[PDB]
């Protein structure tokens, strides 16, 4: 009937747990002690750039580390330019409901898609002096969360229906299909390498995705609410969450076990973005009480605060090169900070 | 994309007449339409600029008082009037294209051009240093052009254009703005500089290079051309 | 600004601005609206009189020169705690229910009480919808009752202030306000004087539900005012 | 039952799950400690960055 | 003298108290970036009439009536006399035109942001900055409130020294129509009905009676005697007249008062 199933569930459970528990020799915060930490830092609004109607959900910055977009609710596609405070595209959408959006790595393409269960595909170097749609992606049930790229024919979507989706470009039509997830998923954070991948879902867990066997190798929980905003390690080695229960924490893909959580009495509201610097030492995570924050990777200490913006934090970006780091609102106002 | 211009021919001195561009197969709305004449035997030069949005129309010094542009944004068509035609209009008139922002590569199409025939200061100066050189198929070749004042500028940027002129056809693009390849052409191509002085480096050859090489800049409003340094097999 | 370039981006990006501008001035002059139900209630119907695995639709409606967009939800996963904070700013909620079925209620009870209560769905006003009424009175006047699955009818009275306009008989009144009232109660537990509710009695084919939507929509926006600049 | 399906593909996904080697936190912890160390020259954002240097002053 | 210090000691906390309280409003108005809206902009512009008048005009008044002598030239009485002029109509019709803005957000709940946008606020700005410098000027200057009177002000107040604006059989009524009676109907008659649309809805206040109380405690009194003081025969004790300018004075600074800190949205 249904003893068989559990008893080699707990029999799974136990196998691995023991191990996984005996690997913990200490916490992190142990060798950490010793390192003198960085201290207290100000940072600064630079620009202010205006002009979204509505709310904004997405931002991405561009390889170019001077370009960026975003994605509004009045259906609109925006290209900036981040030094000269320019707008250099506007792009107008179909459905206005939309919830991410990408640039391309090599700076030709944008995708967009939300609660039409479709993304797009918008090409940006043409013969006429326009951006026009190129390819439609049909085939999702529920409403993309995420977007990414690998390359200019590989692009990999989550979706609203528990299943993430590797596609190709080219002819349309999916090429591997990753099924897990109990609940909807809503982000995933690529590697360095463009050969694996994590996954976040309303689940409380967070697993790996290989793409070119497609077929999942490991899986991490304890986190006590669903997630909603997870970031790789410019390692490659390292990822961090985001939570609706006030908690970020971080993980180790080889030793299989929990790092420090970065979590405190007065914070209530729950994380919506996270994402590190370029060597490693500091995470910026929005908070939905109106003001971003910045952490010690290291010592899992505040140092500073970024405050300025009137309404929630939506998305978060840091530039390829540590220049500077953009925050975007449900205000309609994205601030540069240097 | 596909430009196309007709009209012209000869008149009597003094007259005036309106010459017709009309553009086909792509956004107009968003292209500036610079005037880039041709002398019949002597290098371009500039005669007008209207912006995509009709806001600001630079015009030429040696022509400023008789020369207007318009344009019919809705129906897609450019237009040039002239006043009291000098022995001077006599040049080539080309319909070039332009589109600026962030990344962007100016003077990319061109037109075949119309011809008129007309019966019986601080500008930054260039000059190209020959006029005319021999080749091998299979060679290297380098032409160098030299700039009055430096061009560099405080953003670090170069506005130099390397455009190419084949013989029987309109102009091209290789090089925009010093070290940049343009819309797909052969990548044998190349170029370098060092603030005052320019080389262009062909690597192999081809019968097709075969043509006149012009020099540009872009630096400030007036725009001022090389000589030509034409190549023979 | 200084080379002729910098001075052409300046130019563009300020075209592109005069384009914002215009559509927020589209943008300022319409009104969006949810529209929210079941299966079995008429809601399908509801869409086409006033008129491919999508995820969304949506349908245009204007009376008196006053431009109404409502969005309704195609093909989507159950659960809808996740996609819901996309529409915290919208006019009100169109809810939908079909008063026939007298044991499938419980169900529309539950989301009633899901809905109204939802964190980010404060400030929002609720408009009620009854549909499918000339079945509740094809199934009563046989006698299948209400009894059988709420006990609570029998000591159920018609309050003073009913008033039955077509008096076919007092018992499809009866059960009809009983239903009503049994919805009602839900709003008035909370609320705290932010967001109401606005019941109607409506049937298969009811060319007043355009009329009905802008009265409750202005009596909402007059309310909203009159709270903001101190007049409430 | 008709749910064997489902029921069989969790046994072996759990299967595969446990087949990953471990490395502790020895190699875990002092990677990280090896990176930031060796970056944190380079990194602009952790230490400032002189005026000149930045292209998003004043 | 005592009366003569406390006399200034309160003219000087009325010219601090309007110069503060306006530029609190026009330094938060203009800074905040989420307080951009076009009614804000209106409340801008009125607290910036109210800082010009406070800073300029109030104190040439207030040392011209404690001696009760004039120590300028005569070119200086016809500036300070249209200028006064020209700051207090228009700080009327600043208030008359936030009441229709109060009044269209109400009567017409839909389509109050499809026709109270910035352009309107804009025309709205300039009209109430322009006709009042035309009409003050126009009266001032170029003399015609004097035209029929000018024997009796020729002969008792130009005699000795004084700077005391004057005013004829219609110029008087002149003024006082066009300052007074257009934008006092206007907001008592708005603030009226709204009265009626919120007894009704509350069925399924008294904030606009402060808002009118204000302005008819305050102005009343000096038009009434303005306008009546011609048809006595300049009986008038010039001592009042003091206390009458004053009034408006004192609306000049408590105005910014009721439009900024008495609404909760503008207090945090
Ligand atoms: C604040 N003083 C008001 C000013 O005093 C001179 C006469 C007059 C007429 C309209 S308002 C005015």
Redesign the pocket.
Known sequence: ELDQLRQEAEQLKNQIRDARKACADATLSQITNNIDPVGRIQMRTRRTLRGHLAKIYAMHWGTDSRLLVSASQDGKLIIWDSYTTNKVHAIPLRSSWVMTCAYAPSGNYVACGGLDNICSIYNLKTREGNVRVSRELAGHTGYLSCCRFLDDNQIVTSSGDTTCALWDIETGQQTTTFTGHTGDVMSLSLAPDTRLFVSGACDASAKLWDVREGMCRQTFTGHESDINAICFFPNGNAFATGSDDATCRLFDLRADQELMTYSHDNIICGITSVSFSKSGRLLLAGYDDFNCNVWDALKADRAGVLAGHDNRVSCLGVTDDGMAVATGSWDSFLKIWN | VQLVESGGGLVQPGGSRKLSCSASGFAFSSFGMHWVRQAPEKGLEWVAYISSGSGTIYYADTVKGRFTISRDDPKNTLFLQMTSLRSEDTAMYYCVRSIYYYGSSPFDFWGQGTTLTVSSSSDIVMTQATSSVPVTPGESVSISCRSSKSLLHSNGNTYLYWFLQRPGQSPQLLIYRMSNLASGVPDRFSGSGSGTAFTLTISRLEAEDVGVYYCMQHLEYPLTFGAGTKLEL | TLSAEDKAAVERSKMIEKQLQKDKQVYRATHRLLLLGADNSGKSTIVKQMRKTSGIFETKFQVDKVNFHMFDVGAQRDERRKWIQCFNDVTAIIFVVDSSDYNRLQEALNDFKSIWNNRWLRTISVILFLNKQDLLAEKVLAGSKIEDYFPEFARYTTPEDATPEPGEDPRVTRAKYFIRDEFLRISTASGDGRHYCYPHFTCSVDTENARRIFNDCRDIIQRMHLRQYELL | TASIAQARKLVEQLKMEANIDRIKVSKAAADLMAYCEAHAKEDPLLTPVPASENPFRE | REVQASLYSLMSLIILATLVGNLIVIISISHFKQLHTPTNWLLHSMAIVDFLLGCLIMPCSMVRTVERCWYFGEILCKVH?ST??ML??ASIFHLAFISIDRYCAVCDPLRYKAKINISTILVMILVSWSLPAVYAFGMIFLELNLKGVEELYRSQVSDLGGCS?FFSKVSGVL?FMT?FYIPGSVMLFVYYRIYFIAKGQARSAKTLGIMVGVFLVCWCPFFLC?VLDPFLGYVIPPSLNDAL?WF??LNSALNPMVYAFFYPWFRR
């Open positions: 006399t006064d002029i207090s109509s604006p003024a300052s303005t300018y408006g004075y």
